[PDB]
Amino acid sequence: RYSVVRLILGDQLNHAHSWFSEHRDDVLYLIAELHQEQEYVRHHIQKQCAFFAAMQAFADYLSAEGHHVWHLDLDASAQYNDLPDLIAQICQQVQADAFQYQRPDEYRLLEQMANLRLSGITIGCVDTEHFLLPFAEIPEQFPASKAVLMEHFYRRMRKRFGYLMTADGKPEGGQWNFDADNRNKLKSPDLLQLPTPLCFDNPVASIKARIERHRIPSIGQVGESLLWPINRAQALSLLAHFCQICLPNFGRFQDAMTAQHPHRWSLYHSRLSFALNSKLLSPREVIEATISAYRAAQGQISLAQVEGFVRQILGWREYVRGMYWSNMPHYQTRNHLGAQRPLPSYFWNGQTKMRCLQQAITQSLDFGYAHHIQRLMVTGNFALLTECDPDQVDAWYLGIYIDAIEWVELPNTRGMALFADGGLIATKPYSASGSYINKMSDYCASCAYQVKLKSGEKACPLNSLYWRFMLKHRDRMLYKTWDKMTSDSQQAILSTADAYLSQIESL
Ligand SMILES: Cc1cc2nc3c(=O)[nH]c(=O)nc-3n(C[C@H](O)[C@H](O)[C@H](O)COP(=O)(O)OP(=O)(O)OC[C@H]3O[C@@H](n4cnc5c(N)ncnc54)[C@H](O)[C@@H]3O)c2cc1C
Ligand SMILES: Cc1nc2c(=O)[nH]c(=O)nc-2n(C[C@H](O)[C@H](O)[C@H](O)CO)c1C
Ligand code: SF4
C-alpha cells in the first residue's frame, strides 16, 4: 500500500514544510485526533474545536496538493489504544518500510515518539522548520539550570536576524528596548477609538457533537460558531488586520486593561498566538510583515510599537522555548517558594468579587484567550501572592487557553508568574498590589473593593497579600513603603491578608 508513513501532529500545520515540497505516491501522511492528547490536560472546548478544524483544513489542503493524507477523527481513532498503537497498526496495514515524524513541541510527546519502536521499520525524526532558533543550538544558547538573561539573547537574535538594525550594527532608534514608552493606560478618548476585532465564522456543531459523543472532558463554552482562525488564509487575514489596524497602537497599550468596552478582550493585540503555535504562520513571516507595515506607514507606526511586537516573538518566544527545552524534565518539578494552596474554585466560573480577577477569568472561560498583562499581573499575580499550587496553576493555564502548548505555557507560568524556578526567567517576582492594576486599568472603578484602602473591610486584597508576600520572602527601596508605617498599620495589614487568605473562596 505505502512504503513510507509520515505523521503530522495538531501543532505542526506548516504549509511550507520541506516534506510537502516533494510529491510522492509512496508516502502516506497521517493526521489524527487523539484521546491521549485530550487526556493529558482538560483543554478548552474552543481549543479542541480550533485544533480539530485546523487539522481537517490542513489535511484538505494537502490532499488538494496531491499528497496522500489519511485524516482520522475521534470516531476512527478510538479503536487504537494510543498514538504508538495507531502508528504501528497503520504501518503494518500499509506494509510500510519507514516511519517519520516531526519533532514534537512537548516533552511528553517527544519522549513518547523517541521511545516508539516499530518492527522492521526505520524511524526518523525531522525538524518542524518553524522556529527561528534551530533546535540543536539550544544547549549552547541556554545552559541547563542557568538564569539566562532575556535581554542579551534578544539582542543576539536581533543582530543575527537583522531586525530593526542600523547599517553599522546598532539598535534602531538609539536603544534596544522601547518598553518605557509602552506603559500607557486606556482613557475615554482612547476607549471610544477601540477598533472592532477581526472575527471569523467557523461552524463547530459537528466537532462539538463528536467530542461529546466520545465523552471527551473539556472546559469553557462555545456557541455555534468559532471566531478563531482555523486555516492559513484566516491566519494571514488576522495578521494583515493587526498590521493595518492595531500595530500603530500595539505597544502604546500593551499593558492596558479595561472592563468597559465590548472589545476589551482583544484591544490592540494580534491574537496570532494560536496560529503561530499551531504553525499556520511562521514567526519570521509575522515579524517581517509587521516590520514592512511599520516601514510603509511613514511614521504612523512609531518604532516603539514595532519594537515591542518584535521583542515578544523574536526574543521572548524563542527564549521561552530554549529555556523549556534546556530545563524541562527537572523544570516541571520546581517549586521554589513551596506554594501548595489549592487553586480557588472561581477560577472555573469567574464568580469573584475582585473585578480584575472576574474580568480575566470570565474572558478566559468565554473566549479561551487573555492578553499577556492579564495572565501575568491579574491571574499570575493572584496565584503568586496567594501561593497557589503550581501544578494546578499549570493545569489551568495549559487547558483554558487555545494557544497553550507546554513549551511556552510552563516557563511563563511557573517561572515568570509564580517565581517557582527561583528566577531563572523572571529574575524577580512580578508581585504587585492593587496600585499597579489601578494605574494600568479601570477595574478598580468597577470593583466592590477599594484600591486606596490597604487594610480593613472592603480593602483591596492585593494590597495586603503583596505585602505579606514581600515580608515572607524579604531575605532575597520597596520595603521602604513598609518601613515607613506604624507597627499597628503593619499588623492590621498582615491580619487583613491572613483573613483574606482564610476566606479566599469568598473574595
Ligand atoms: C502566565 C503566562 C502564561 C502564558 N502562557 C502562554 C501560552 O500557553 N502560550 C503562548 O503562546 N503564550 C503564553 N504566554 C505569553 C502571552 O500571554 C501570549 O503570547 C499572548 O497573550 C497571546 O496573545 P497575542 O497573540 O495577542 O499576543 P500579542 O500581545 O499580540 O504578542 C505578539 C506575539 O508575541 C508572542 N509572545 C508574547 N509574549 C510572549 C511570551 N511571554 N512568551 C512567548 N511568546 C510570547 C506570541 O506569539 C504573540 O502572538 C503566557 C504569558 C504568561 C504571563
Ligand atoms: C487539543 C489538541 N488536540 C490534538 C489532537 O487531537 N491531535 C494532535 O495530534 N494534537 C493535538 N493537540 C496538540 C498536542 O496535544 C500537543 O500540544 C502538540 O502536538 C505538541 O507539539 C492539541 C492541543
Ligand atoms: S480594587 Fe483590587 S481587587 Fe478590585 S479591581 Fe482593583 S486591584 Fe482588583
Numbering used by the authors: 2 to 477, 486 to 516
Paper quotes:
We determined the crystal structure of Vc (6-4) PL at 2.5 Å resolution at cryogenic temperature at the Turkish Light Source known as “Turkish DeLight”. The structure contains all the cofactors with well-defined electron densities and contains a total of 24 α helixes and five β sheets. It consists of two domains: an α-helical domain that is associated with FAD and α/β domain which interacts with DMRL cofactor. We identified a critical water molecule (W22) that interacts with Asp12, Gln13, Asp106, and DMRL in Vc (6-4) PL. However, the W22 molecule interacts with Asp106 of the Vc (6-4) PL with a distance of 2.8 Å, while the same interaction occurs with Gly105 of other bacterial (6-4) PLs with a distance of over 3.3 Å. Unlike At (6-4) PL or Rs (6-4) PL, Vc (6-4) PL Glu410 amino acid faces away from FAD and interacts with Asp395 rather than a His365 residue. Cys357, Cys445, Cys448, and Cys461 sulfide atoms make bonds with Fe atoms in the cluster with each bond at 2.3 Å distance. The function of the [4Fe-4S] cluster is currently unknown; however, its distance to the FAD is 17 Å, which indicates it does not have a catalytic role in the DNA repair due to its large distance to the active site region. Notably, we have not observed a distinct electron density of amino acid residues between 478 and 485 Vc (6-4) PL. Due to the position of the 23rd helix, DNA lesions cannot bind the Vc (6-4) PL similar to Dm (6-4) PL.
Photolyases (PLs) reverse UV-induced DNA damage using blue light as an energy source. Of these PLs, (6-4) PLs repair (6-4)-lesioned photoproducts. However, studies with different bacteria revealed the presence of (6–4) PLs. These bacterial (6–4) PLs are distinct in that they contain [4 Fe-4 S] as well as DMRL and FAD cofactors.
